[PDB]
Amino acid sequence: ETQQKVQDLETRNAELEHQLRAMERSLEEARAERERARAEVGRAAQLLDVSLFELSELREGLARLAEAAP
Amino acid sequence: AAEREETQQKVQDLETRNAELEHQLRAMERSLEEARAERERARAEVGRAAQLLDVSLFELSELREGLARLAEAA
Amino acid sequence: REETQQKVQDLETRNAELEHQLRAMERSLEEARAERERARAEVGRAAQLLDVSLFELSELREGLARLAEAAP
Amino acid sequence: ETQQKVQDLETRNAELEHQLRAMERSLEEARAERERARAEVGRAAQLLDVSLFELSELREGLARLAEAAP
């Protein structure tokens, strides 16, 4: 019955090891979701980047028009 | 009299084809004036809209950049 | 008696001038209207393009909105 | 044999405990981070909502003086 103490700790362990394997899966999921979201964000930035440049050429267009003479 | 008659005519004629040619200009000119007028407006209007757009786009790049920082953040 | 045969060959001159000035002016006004029509069309093309670009930005917007709400 | 299998687990366990309160913590960090990132994202959407509407008016403005034939 301190071959019992032993028994008890062989079980604390297994459950500490069962729990930790629960947290690893949970962490791994968070990192995954994070990557996938950050990338969706970078995709918006890239899109925006391109489409803002075109919006500028358009602005420059209008300005040339406004300041032409006679 | 005999025909000096018929060129004091040829003046008063030319006098009214003139008078006329004048009344037509003072109408062309007024029409030019409303072209120039209208143009000047319309162009100012466009320029104002461009200038507005610029402010609105520079604001949009601060934003691309922010989103960019967010995506890249480690 | 020739005394105003000057005022004829005279008006022969300030008329052919006014004719020239008028068909000029009339030519100015024509290319005024042409410029106008071209400039407006350029403005309409810009507007059209803008709108297509705005419609695109709204989908982008809804996207980001969706990502914000997205609760996992 | 025994006094020693217990000596082993007193640490091996007491170690696994810290290495769990660790994850638990690094996962609370992960979550606090997701909510802060999605909020920034939502703020972008919102800025963007308001600034698009103004862009449309600019637009309609432009359309108006293209059709302004009279």
From Swiss-Prot, chain B:
Which cellular compartments is it found in? Cytoplasm; Postsynaptic density; Synapse
An individual GO BP term: negative regulation of calcineurin-NFAT signaling cascade
- Name where it mostly resides: cytoplasm
Q: Which UniProt keywords apply?
A: Coiled coil, Cytoplasm, Phosphoprotein, Synapse
Indicate whether Ribonucleoprotein appears among the record's keywords.
no
Q: Name one GO molecular function term.
A: G protein-coupled glutamate receptor binding
Q: Name one GO cellular component term.
A: dendrite
Residue spans making up a coiled coil are 1-72
- SS bond partners: none
Say if the entry is tagged with keyword Signal. no
Q: Where is the signal peptide?
A: none
Function, in words: Postsynaptic density scaffolding protein. Binds and cross-links cytoplasmic regions of GRM1, GRM5, ITPR1, DNM3, RYR1, RYR2, SHANK1 and SHANK3. By physically linking GRM1 and GRM5 with ER-associated ITPR1 receptors, it aids the coupling of surface receptors to intracellular calcium release. Isoforms can be differently regulated and may play an important role in maintaining the plasticity at glutamatergic synapses. Negatively regulates T cell activation by inhibiting the calcineurin-NFAT pathway.
Give the similarity note. Belongs to the Homer family.
The record's subunit annotation is: Tetramer. Isoform 1 and isoform 2 encode coiled-coil structures that mediate homo- and heteromultimerization. Interacts with NFATC2; interaction is calcium independent; interaction competes with PPP3CA for NFATC2 binding; interaction is reduced by AKT activation. Interacts with NFATC1 and NFATC4. Interacts with SHANK1; forms a high-order complex at least composed of SHANK1 and HOMER3; the complex formation is regulated by CAMK2A-mediated phosphorylation.
**Domain remark in the UniProt entry:** The WH1 domain interacts with the PPXXF motif in GRM1, GRM5, RYR1, RYR2, ITPR1, SHANK 1 and SHANK3.
What is the protein name stated in its UniProt record? Homer protein homolog 3
User: In which organism is this protein found?
Assistant: Homo sapiens (Human)
